[PDB]
């Protein structure tokens, strides 16, 4: 009757342990679940950013070119005027000769 009273006490608590372990099991199971669920949401973030970076990288070089061509066309606009000043001088050099 004594040995039984000390067993019903162990058995009682050994289960208090189990039921508290399942609780810890789910804490660990639901953990791996949420982290796997967020894992794909990260793939899209990474995706959209590695694209956003690609786009900007392309877009930035274009601008660099745009300024180059502009600076080219700017030089030519000057050459042209110079030539027209030369033609006006020619035209005025004939009308200026009767």
């Amino acid at each position: 009757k004594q040995a039984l009273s000390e067993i019903e006490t162990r058995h009682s608590e050994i289960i208090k342990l189990e039921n508290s372990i399942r609780e810890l099991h789910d804490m660990f199971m639901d953990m791996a679940m949420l982290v796997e669920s967020q894992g794909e949401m990260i793939d899209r973030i990474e995706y959209n950013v590695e694209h956003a970076v690609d786009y900007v990288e392309r877009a930035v070089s274009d601008t660099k070119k745009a300024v180059k061509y502009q600076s080219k066309a700017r030089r030519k606009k000057i050459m042209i005027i110079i030539c027209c000043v030369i033609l006006g001088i020619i035209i005025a050099s004939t009308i200026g000769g009767i």
């Binding site: 342990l17 508290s20 973030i45 786009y55």
Partner: protein, 91 residues
Amino acid sequence: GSHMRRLQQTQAQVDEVVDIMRVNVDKVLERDQKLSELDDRADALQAGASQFETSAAKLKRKYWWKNLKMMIILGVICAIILIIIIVYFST
């Protein structure tokens, strides 16, 4: 007899690890919000980058075109100056 301290120990451990995981889910639960908000700015950026992308490709073609016309016009006008420089020098 030690078969009761073992339970008072092991159960002590467990409670502690569970007290920890409650917190750990609160940290993951925030990582879901912090993470979900960044998925939005990631998409709301690849879009504006794809837009500024096109707006950059446009300015490029615009000045390549603008440049082309100049060389042509220079071509003709320089041909003219050439013609003249030749007729009044070819005997």
